[PDB]
Design a binder for this molecule. Structure first.
Ligand SMILES: Cc1cc2nc3c(=O)[nH]c(=O)nc-3n(C[C@H](O)[C@H](O)[C@H](O)COP(=O)(O)O)c2cc1C
Lengths: 130, 845
């Protein structure tokens, strides 16, 4: 398959990806790009309600807690509570939204307009001077 | 009003709220039970001694039920009725007895025998308290079959599964006395009648067929070599099978006909087929005994006339000694051969049949798999074949890793089955005529209209309902002379299979499971109660469970690892695999290559195209040199772009600066997404170090062989939440390469790999185009080898990218690469001798 000299690496790899996409469209999506499901962003998936309220305790499981805070829809809240990394210029530091909302006794997260990404507001509240 | 009654045994204890109106009676028993109950030891490891509270309350139900008698109403009835109702409310949370039994085995330090004792006690208690199993259980499986989410097929085994088949009948008679007791006694009077009715029966039954006496007193039971003889083993294996069917019906509150109507179809390996036609005629508990009489009678005459046609003669002591001191079995009339093809075996039997006359020839009798056959014939003849085989096989502890795949001497196993007749052979043909006469003299005919479900013929896989001729005559023919093509008869489309047959985990169930792995079929072993640590097949408990543990499905690889398309908001379409889903970009990678990916210009340029690429540590000799390459990669890639790093495991010098550097650079947050470890797989303690310390998203491993894949699977099991990228490459790959085929190792290892949801499974060696990779993406590649589809999660492209514009490879080297014609997969191994397609193999330092 090594025949054409000086083919750009983008063109070889895209050639292979776009090859598969054309065969997978033909076989499993009757040649129709409209049948392809859409997400906001594709990635960061581990291989393993409008107005809600979540009271954390000492027993509250981290993973369950962030899955609830994140919501079902793929959008900025999903990223915010499930991305393990964010970027600072070119560096990849720990996600500070998952550090701040890390569950513990007293914390109370209220989600408002959960079903509309553009207007959702997550509001963490803790006991401050009683 | 009510008074607490403390019944105990050392540390374990249970409180029972007995009403005061019948308290004096419950205390009478409490004392009497405390006498028979032995002294409490440490860990309760001794026999006839409870190990959990549940066992103790069991024992108490067993003791109370022994004094009670069901004919007349006693004083103790009102205590049994209550103490039982306390067992139900405390320990059986709606579930059936078997589901508790199972739960006590895996959690607590209970032995199998104690659990069997606990089930007996509960079942006896239930029956003798005048509370029969009348109501239909809420078993998840039989719920799902009513709805249409499950399709049940029943299979019945036969001969050559265990030597100690009688222990299964002894276990049924003990543990389920009250359920099967009536069946087993009827089968014993039916056999005793057939012996005195038939002319020369008693001549074949030298030590009688008083099975009742053998079940009561284990001392009066004849030796195994008499029980194994087909005139006994035929009808008794039928009885065992019908007893498991009854139990299964009676604990589900179904009539036979009801349980038969839940089955899409039945079928049976060898004499199992007689049982399979027997259950398919059943309707009610009243007319169950005419369908049993027919089955037992057929198997009785098959077992007698086949034994009269070919009795087992004394084998020369020279042959018995040669077989034992060559790690083979005792020569019998059936020789299993594992891990050879049917053509390869039919070769060796055609060599061995040329030298032998007509009446001593061997034939292939059972085709249980692609690579799992059984040859029938005279035992001396099969010892012949076995001498012709032991010179052709490699020792089982030979190292063939350094030998190219096609030159490797084929290794296999060959044991003799524990069976005393050559079923499915020309030797038994003379018996056929005699059997067809004994079936019309005893009025035993199977009629096509009375058979309510399809029963699959073991030869061609056809239904026996659509037969023009006699069904009995065909079933006999299928057992005595026609071969069994098991894969051809199990072409039915079912989700669940119930193995009723004898042998449990060694039986027909587990074999059917190996044949059908990855097609989304779950086998349940309906006879044996036990635990499977793998959980690939289920046991008796799974039939009766009412929770979500009753309907467990097996992974269908084509549906579960189907490649999909997806698009993001910007409308860029991606191929969605387990791998691409993680890395958020197309499931193609440029693996680490010295010197192709040592260039920070080519790593940036591929990372910027939007593809994973490993920077090759092979081109670097210090942390300082690598650090300055990484800094150059970062400089050229966009914000949020990442890349990997390839380290060589057989360069310890390069790991002892590389691993600390990766750890340091990730602590400052450099965009190193993953580490790949080339040339061998790290040990568990080293792999655990890399996973937990290095701050990586996933870890690439590049297993050479089967043992290396098993070592990757062990690393994955240790860190079940951490993604492992198992980059499988055949030896046909560029650079340092193994001796292994690309396909054969994945066909063996793909199921074990897919048990572990954190292994992303990449395929390399010999790819350049969408055209050649697509079959690996959709899993059709494995349908050429007669396996179920095995889709892959991603691809790696080494050789293919060496002539890209951005690669530093000199112009005249690129011309020299592009001029190589290459060769197809089947030729590649020729590189070990001579220049094949412009490419050759040489040895490193
Ligand atoms: C030129 C070249 C250099 C390689 N260098 C390395 C290396 O440094 N480390 C490693 O694990 N594999 C290395 N490999 C093997 C590849 O990572 C991969 O196993 C192989 O390229 C895939 O086979 P293919 O070349 O037929 O596409 C190299 C392969 C080639 C062709």
């Amino acid at each position: 398959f090594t025949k054409v000299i000086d083919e750009p690496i983008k063109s070889i790899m895209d050639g292979i990806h776009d090859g598969h996409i054309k065969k997978l469209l033909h076989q499993y999506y009757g040649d129709d790009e409209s049948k392809i499901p859409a997400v906001e962003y594709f990635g960061g998936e581990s291989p393993v309600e409008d107005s809600a309220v979540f009271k954390a305790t000492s027993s509250t499981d981290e993973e369950s807690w962030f899955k609830a805070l994140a919501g079902s829809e793929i959008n900025w809240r999903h990223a915010s509570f499930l991305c393990s990394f964010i970027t600072q210029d070119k560096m990849f530091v720990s996600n500070p939204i998952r550090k701040v909302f890390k569950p513990s006794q007293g914390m109370v997260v209220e989600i408002s307009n959960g079903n509309t990404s553009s207007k959702t507001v997550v509001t963490l509240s803790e006991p401050v001077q009683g | 009003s009510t008074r607490p009654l403390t019944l105990s045994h050392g540390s374990l204890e249970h409180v029972l709220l007995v009403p005061t109106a019948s308290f004096f009676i419950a205390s009478q028993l409490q004392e009497q039970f405390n006498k028979i109950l032995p002294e409490p030891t440490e860990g309760f490891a001794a026999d006839d001694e409870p190990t959990t509270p549940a066992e103790l309350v069991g024992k108490f139900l067993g003791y109370v039920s022994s004094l009670v008698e069901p004919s007349k109403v006693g004083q103790f009835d009102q205590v049994l009725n209550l103490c039982l109702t306390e067992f139900e409310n405390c320990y059986l949370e709606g579930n059936d007895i078997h589901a508790l039994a199972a739960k006590l085995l895996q959690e607590n330090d209970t032995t199998l025998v104690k659990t069997k004792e606990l089930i007996k006690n509960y079942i006896t208690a239930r029956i003798m308290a005048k509370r029969p199993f009348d109501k239909k259980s809420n078993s998840a499986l039989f719920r799902a079959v009513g709805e249409g989410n499950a399709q049940l097929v029943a299979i019945f085994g036969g001969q050559g599964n265990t030597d100690d088949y009688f222990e299964e009948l002894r276990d049924l008679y003990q543990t389920y006395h009250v359920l099967v007791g009536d069946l087993i006694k009827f089968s014993a009077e039916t056999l005793s009648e057939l012996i005195r009715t038939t002319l020369d029966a008693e001549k074949v039954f030298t030590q009688g067929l008083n099975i009742l006496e053998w079940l009561e007193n284990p001392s009066n039971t004849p030796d195994k070599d008499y029980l194994l003889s087909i005139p006994i083993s035929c009808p008794l294996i039928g009885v065992i099978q019908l007893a498991h069917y009854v139990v299964t019906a009676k604990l589900l509150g179904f009539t036979p006909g009801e349980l038969r109507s839940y089955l899409k179809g039945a079928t049976g390996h060898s004499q199992g087929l007689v049982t399979a036609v027997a259950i398919a005629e059943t309707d009610s508990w009243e007319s169950f005994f005419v369908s049993v009489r027919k089955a037992i009678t057929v198997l009785f005459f098959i077992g007698v006339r086949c034994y009269e046609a070919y009795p087992n003669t004394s084998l020369p002591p020279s042959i018995l000694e040669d077989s034992l001191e060559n790690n083979e079995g005792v020569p019998s009339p059936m020789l299993s051969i594992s891990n050879l093809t049917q053509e390869q075996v039919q070769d060796y039997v055609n060599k061995t049949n040329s030298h032998l006359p007509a009446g001593k020839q061997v034939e292939i009798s059972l085709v249980n798999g692609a690579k799992n056959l059984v040859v029938s014939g005279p035992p001396q003849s099969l010892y012949g074949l076995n001498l012709t085989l032991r010179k052709a096989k490699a020792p089982s502890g030979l190292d063939q890793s350094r030998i190219p795949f096609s030159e490797r001497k084929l290794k296999f196993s060959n044991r003799f089955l524990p069976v005393a007749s050559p079923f499915h052979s020309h030797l038994l043909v003379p018996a056929s005529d005699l059997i067809n006469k004994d079936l019309v003299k005893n009025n035993v005919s199977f009629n096509a209209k009375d058979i309510q479900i399809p029963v699959y013929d073991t030869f061609d896989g056809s239904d026996l309902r659509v037969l023009s001729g006699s069904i009995s005559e065909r079933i006999v023919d299928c057992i005595i002379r026609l071969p069994v093509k098991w894969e051809t008869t199990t072409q039915f489309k079912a989700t669940h299979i119930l193995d009723f047959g004898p042998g449990g985990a060694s039986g027909l169930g587990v074999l059917t499971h190996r044949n059908k792995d990855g097609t989304g079929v779950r086998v349940i072993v309906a006879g044996t109660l036990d635990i499977n640590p793998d959980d690939d097949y289920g046991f008796k408990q799974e039939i009766f469970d009412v929770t979500s543990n009753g309907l467990k499905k097996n992974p269908n690889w084509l549906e579960e690892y189907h490649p999909k398309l997806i698009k993001n908001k910007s409308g860029k379409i991606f191929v969605e695999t387990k791998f691409s889903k993680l890395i958020g970009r197309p499931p193609l990678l440029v693996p680490g290559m010295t010197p192709c990916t040592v260039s920070p210009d080519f790593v940036a340029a591929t990372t910027n195209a939007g593809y994973t690429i490993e920077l090759a540590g092979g081109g670097y000799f210090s942390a300082a040199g690598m650090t300055a390459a990484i800094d150059s990669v970062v400089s050229q890639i966009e914000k949020g772009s990442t890349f990997g790093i390839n380290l060589i495991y057989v360069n310890p010098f390069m790991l002892q600066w590389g691993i600390p550097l990766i750890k340091e650079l990730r602590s400052k947050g450099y965009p190193i997404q993953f580490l790949t470890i080339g040339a061998g797989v790290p040990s568990l303690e080293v792999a655990s170090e890399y996973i937990e310390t290095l701050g990586l998203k996933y870890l690439g491993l590049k297993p050479g062989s089967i043992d290396a894949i098993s070592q990757v699977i062990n690393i994955a099991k240790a860190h079940p939440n951490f993604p492992i990228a198992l980059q499988w490459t055949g030896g046909r790959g560029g650079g340092h390469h193994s001796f292994e085929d690309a396909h054969t190792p994945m066909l063996q290892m793909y199921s074990k790999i897919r048990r572990h949801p954190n292994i992303m499974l990449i395929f390399g060696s010999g790819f350049g185009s969408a055209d050649d990779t697509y079959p690996y993406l959709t899993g059709e590649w494995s349908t050429k080898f007669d396996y179920p589809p095995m889709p892959f999660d991603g691809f790696l492209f080494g050789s293919r990218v060496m002539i890209a514009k951005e690669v530093k490879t000199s112009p005249d080297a690129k011309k020299c690469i592009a001029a190589c014609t290459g060769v197809p997969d089947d030729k590649w191994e020729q590189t070990y001798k001579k220049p094949t397609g412009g490419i050759v193999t040489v040895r490193s330092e």
